[PDB]
């Protein structure tokens, strides 16, 4: 328990920062690369609007999840 906990709080926010944070970014990376090939076509005022929506639907993702594995990585710090 003790000893264990640590591990599933750490892991906790390890793996909810790590896959949210990077969920995010990669998604970001990957669901961005490919919109903007489609986005090409066409002016940069329709597209730039999902464009962005995703980009930031991303850079938005790990903040929450971040800060969450950020408090609840404190506390491994300091039951």
């Known amino acids: ?3 264990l906990n640590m ?3 750490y892991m906790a926010a390890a793996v909810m920062m790590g896959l ?3 969920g995010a970014a990669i ?3 990957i669901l961005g690369g490919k919109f903007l090939e489609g986005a090409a076509r066409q002016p940069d005022l329709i597209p730039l609007l999902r464009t962005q929506f ?3 639907m991303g850079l ?3 903040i929450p999840m971040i800060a969450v594995g950020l408090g609840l990585y404190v506390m ?3 039951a």
């Open 20 to 22: 949210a944070a990077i």
């Open 76 to 78: 491994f710090a300091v």
């Open 27 to 29: 998604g970001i990376g």
């Open 1 to 3: 328990m003790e000893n």
């Open 60 to 62: 938005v993702d790990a």
């Open 7 to 9: 591990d599933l709080l």
């Open 54 to 56: 995703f980009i930031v």
